[PDB]
Amino acid sequence: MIKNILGLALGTNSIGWALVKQDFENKQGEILGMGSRIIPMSQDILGDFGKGNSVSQTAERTKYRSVRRLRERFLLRRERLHRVLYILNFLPEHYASQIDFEKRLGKFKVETEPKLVWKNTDGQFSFLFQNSFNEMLEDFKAAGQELKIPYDWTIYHLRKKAISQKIEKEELAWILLNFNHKRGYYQLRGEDFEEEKDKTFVRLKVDRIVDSGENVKGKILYDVYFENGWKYDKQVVKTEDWVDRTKEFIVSESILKNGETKRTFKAVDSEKDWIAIKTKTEQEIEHSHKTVGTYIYETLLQNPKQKIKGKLVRTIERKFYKEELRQILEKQKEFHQELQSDDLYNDCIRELYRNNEVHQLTLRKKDFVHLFMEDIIFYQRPLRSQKSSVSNCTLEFRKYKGENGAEHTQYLKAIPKSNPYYQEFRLWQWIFNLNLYTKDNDENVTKVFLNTTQDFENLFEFLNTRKEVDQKALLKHFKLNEKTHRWNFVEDKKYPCNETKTMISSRLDKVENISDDFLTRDIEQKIWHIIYSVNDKVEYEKALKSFARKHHLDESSFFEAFRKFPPFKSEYGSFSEKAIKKLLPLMRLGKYWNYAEIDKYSRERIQKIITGEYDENIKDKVREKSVHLTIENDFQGLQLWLAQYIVYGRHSEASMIGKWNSANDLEVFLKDFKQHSLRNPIVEQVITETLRVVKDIWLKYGNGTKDFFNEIHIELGDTRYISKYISGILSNIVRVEDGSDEGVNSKNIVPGNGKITTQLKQDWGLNDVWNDLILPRFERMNQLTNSKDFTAWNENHQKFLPTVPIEFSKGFSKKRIDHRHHALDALVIACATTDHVNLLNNQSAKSDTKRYDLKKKLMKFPKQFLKPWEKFTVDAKHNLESIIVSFKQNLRVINKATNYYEKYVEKDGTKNKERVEQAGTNWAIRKPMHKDTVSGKVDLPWVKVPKGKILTATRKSLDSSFDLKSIGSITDTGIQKILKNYLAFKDGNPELAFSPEGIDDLNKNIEKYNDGKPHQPINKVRVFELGSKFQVGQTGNKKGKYVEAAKGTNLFFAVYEDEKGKRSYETIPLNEVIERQKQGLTSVPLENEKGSRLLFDLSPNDLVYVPEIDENIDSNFVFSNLNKEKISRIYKVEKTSGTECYFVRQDIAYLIKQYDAKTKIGELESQNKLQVTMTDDRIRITDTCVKINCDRLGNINFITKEKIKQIFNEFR
Amino acid sequence: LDKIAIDTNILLYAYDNRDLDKQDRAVEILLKKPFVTQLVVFEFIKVLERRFKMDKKEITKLTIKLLKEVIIPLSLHRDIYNYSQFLLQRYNFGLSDILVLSDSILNNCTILLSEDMCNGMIVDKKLKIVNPFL
C-alpha cells in the first residue's frame, strides 16, 4: 500500500543512497531524500586496482616495519658484540671509554660518534694501527704501484693476515664488527637440492649455426654450437643477434637415470641480474680457492681504484663469511690464551644469559668460536609460527568458565590435510562415492560389480598400496578395460589416494634389514608427527635418529631414506581430527566396521533411530531419510551427510537466516566486524561505509522505529564478488519471518543493472535533467576556450547539449564529472520496481499475451516507460540541485599504541619469561613525517640567500638531463667550469655530451678541461637548492639531515582575523601539530603571534561557504534554507602550501579538461584548482569564507537553543 | 639562564609582617624581578580586599606600582584551559593551582617559587616547584 524503498549504488569509492516513500497503486510518491558519500582515493589507486601492485596501506606499513626490524636486529647484534668484547677486554681503551656497560649496555654514550681505528686527543685524530699500515705499505711496494693509501684500507689486508699470523685483540674486535656489519645472503629452510646445483655462469661464443630444418610459420630454424661442445636446447630464429656473439648463461647439469648430464640453459645479463651477479662473484671467489676477504684484497692489490661494496662483491652466500670467520678465529685461538680460557667464557655467557639458566648450562660446553659464529653474528631467528591463523573446526566446540565469571566456547583448530586420519577419510569418501559407467550402452553398471562388502574392502586394500588412483589402475582393479568402461569422472585426471601411507611403506621397505610388520597405524601417526612437527633441518635429523634408536631398527639407511622426506604441503581441512575420529568408524565397512569404537552419543542416537521412538532431536526428515536403517548393522558404507547428522544432530549448514530488529544489531555487527576479513581493503572499507550510512539514515528517518525500511536495492556498476556478500549482510533487515521469504538471500533485495538504469534515465527525462544540470560548466568552458564546440544545438529538443572536441574525447564522460550521479543512480534504482528488472531480463516471452499486461502497466504505448508519479522530474531536479556531498576525512595525526615485550619477571620466588607492557605513554604517529630523500645544508658565497631560507644540496647522478642552467646549479664551482668546458667542446649538446661513454671520455681526459690540472673522475655531483627544509631530528647527526614535507600531510590551514577585521592565513607543519596534540592542546594554535583571534582551521575535504559580494554574513546562522545559489556557493579545500589555499566547487569530481603545458588551457588553470571562486566574480575565497560542518547524510549542523541546553545538561 | 615565576603566597608574605623572616625571604625573592601570571595578581587582590580589609583604591595603587616596578606580569595564554585539562591527568592539585602551573609552563617558566604546593617534584618535565622558605 505504502512502500519504503532504499536504493544504493556502490561505486569503487563512492556510495549513493536514496530513500523514497511511494504508493505504486495510485501513481503517488514523494522522495524522502538522497545523498552521496565519497571516500577520497586519488586517481592512482583507481587506475591501479584493476591490476594491483602493492595496492594497500597495510602493505607499505609492513614494509617499513620489516625494514625497522632488520635494523634493530643488527643493532642488537652489535650491542652483544660490544658486551662480549669488553668482558674479554679486546677493545682499545678510548673506544671502551665511550660505551656504557651499566644501564644502557653496549650502546654508545649520548652525543658520541666513536671509531675503532681513530683516537681523538686535543682536537686531533690519529690512526691506531701504525705497524699494520706500514706492512700494507710494504705490500704495495712489492706490488710497486703507489705509496699513497688511506689509513682505512688496512681492514682487508688484516683480514687476510689473520689467516696465518697473530694480530692484536683490537684487530679481532675490528674484524668481528666488520663481519657483523656485512652478513650475506642465506636461506633458512635448507632442504638441499640435487647433489650438483651447478648453476654455473659462463660466457660462450657461438661458432656456427647449422640449419636444423625446422620450418615453422614460414621460417627455418637453426641450432647453436659452442667451442666447448654445448648446444642451446631451445631453437634460434633471428641470426643477427646470435652469429659469432659471446652469449652468457647460467647452466645447471643434472645427472639423469640414463647416465648423461641434462644441461639447462637460461639467459643472464652481467651487472643487471641479481642472480647473475651473485653467481659470477661466487665463481670468481671459488676458482681463486681463497676467502672472500682475501679475494677483495687481491682485487685491491691489482687495482687500488676499484670500489668494493655494492660493485665488486654485493651478494654471496653466508657460508663464505662463515668459513672465513671460523678460519680466522681458529687460527687466532692458539696465539691468544684468552680465547682458550674458561672463567672469561663463563662470565660472558652469564652476562648474555643471566636470567636464562638453561641456555647458560647448554652453552657452557662450547668454545668462543661457537659464541662468535653461531650465537651472536650468524644467528638467524626461525620463522614465527603460522598456526595461529589456521581456521577452526565447524563441528567441535568446548565450553569453559573463564576468569570473567561467564561460560564461553573455544573452537578446535583444523586438522592438517596431511594427517593420515584425514587422508583415510578422503579416500573412504572417494571410494564410497564411486559409481561406474560403461561405453556400449552407457548404463550404470555400478552396484553390480560393487554390491557386497568384500569388493569395497578389496578396493580399499588395493588403494592403500598406491599413492594416486587414476583411470587405468581403477579399471584394472576390476579387470576392466579402457575401451569398454569409465568411472563417471574425468578420463585424464588423477585424485589423491592416501599417498602418505604408501610413501612410508616404500621408505620402510627401502631401509630393509627388518620384517614387514614394523609399520602400523601408530607408527604411521608417529612418523607424521615427527616429520610435520619438527620443521627444522638439524632437529629433524636428531628426531629421525632418536626414532631409529628407540625402535629396534638399524639406523644406517633409514636415516638416509627419511632425511630427504619432502616437507608436507601447507593445507588444512575444514573439520578437525576429533570430527574425523568420531565419524570414521561409521563409514568403514567389513572388518573395518565396528560398533565398539563408536562413542556414547552416536550409539544412543543409532539405537533411538532403529527403535523408532520419538526424540526431541528427531524430525520427520530423519525418519524419511533414515527409514532404511532398521538394524544397527545396516550402518555400513555410510556417507558424510548421514553420518554427520548421526554424530552431531544437525543436517548440513542451514545458516541462521538472521533478522536485525533495529540499528542496535547493525551497530553491534559493525563494532564486531573484523579487519582484513575480505579479499582487499577497498571492498571492505566500501562495505563498512555503506553500513555506516545505512545506520545513520535508519536512525534519522526511522527515529528508532523497527521495520521502517521495506525494500533495499543494490547496484554495483573485479567488484562483482561484493554483490552476494552485501546481499547476505543486508538481508537481515527486511527479511519476512512468516516463511514466504526464506533462503540464503531475501527476495526483497532486488539487484539492478545498467540496462534498466539507462532505459529509465532516457525514458523518464533524467538524462535531460543531468545535461541541463551540468551545462553551466560547459558554457563556462566555451567562454574560456573562446569556441562554441563544447555546446551543440539540437532541434529535436530545441536546446544546447554538452559536446567535446575529438582530441579531448579520449576518456571524456559526461556522467562522471559530478559527484551527484551516484545519488541519481540510487534514485533510479530505488524507483525501479522488480517488475521492471524482471521484464528487461526476461524480454524473450514466447507469447505476447504473457507480458502484454506488464507492457501496459509499465510502458506507455512499446515507446516509453511511465513515470512513477506526476512530479517525478521536478522533484528529482530540485533535490539534485539541493543536495550537498559529504566527504570522509582522515585526520589521524597521533594515536595510542601498546607495546608488549618479553622479559624475565620475578614471581613466587622464581624467574619466568613473560610479556610486559611498556611503561608510560607511547604515542604512534599516523602519518609519514617527511620525504625519503635527505639533503645536507651547505653555504656558497656566490649565491645571495634571503632571510628565512637556506641552501641545501644533495647528490645526483650525471646524465644527459643536465643543461647550462643545471650546470649553473651545482655546488662545486670547479666542477661547473669543467662541465662548461666539456659541453663547449660538445657544441652545447647535453644529449651527446653526457652519455655514459661521453662521461668516461670526460673522466679520462679531465686534464683537457681543467687546464691540465689533475682531477678525479666524475660520476655524481651535489646539486643545490635555495629553500626551506626542516631537520629530521635533534640528537646525534640527525641535525645534519634536511628533508621536505611529505605528500598529503599539510592537514591544517589556520585562518585568523585581527581586531579591526583583516584576515591572516598560515599553514601549520605536521611537527607542530604532533607536539601540540601530544601536549594535549588543540591542533591549530588559538592565537597567532600577530595578535589575531583564530577564526577557523581548514583540512582537506572540508566544506566552506562563500557569501555573495553584496551580502554581509556575520551571525547569519540559519543553515536550513539552502536553495540553489547557497548550495552552489559551497567549496571544498583540496591542498595547501604556505598561505595559499586551493578550493574546488564541491560538486566537481573530474575536470572536463585537465591542464597541459603545451596549449596551456585547462578547466581550472595550471593548478587544476583556483584560490578564488570559479565563477566570473573571482573573489578570494579565504577572505569571506565560513566553515561548515556536516554529518554523514550531508545535513548541515549549526548551534541551536536545544544544543546549548544539552551541552551542559550532560555535565549535570 | 632559566625563567622564574612566583605564587600568590610569596606576595602575601612580602606584604604581611607576622613572620618577619619569611617576609625578608619574600622581599629578597622579589628583588630579582620575577615573572608573575595574572591569576596570581587577581588572587592577591582578592585576598587583600577580603583578608586584610584594605579599601579598593589603595589596593589598585599597590598593584599598579608592583607591576610597574617590582615584578613582570605574564600575558595570559590561550592554551591555558586545554593544558590544564592535560595536567590534571597526572597531577592532583587544586584547580586554581593547576591553572597557575599551566600559565607558568606555557610561558616557558622553569621555576615556580611557591610554598603550599608540595615543593620538589618536576611538573611535566618542564617546570619544578621550589619552596624558598626552606
Ligand SMILES: [Mg+2]
Ligand atoms: Mg594558589
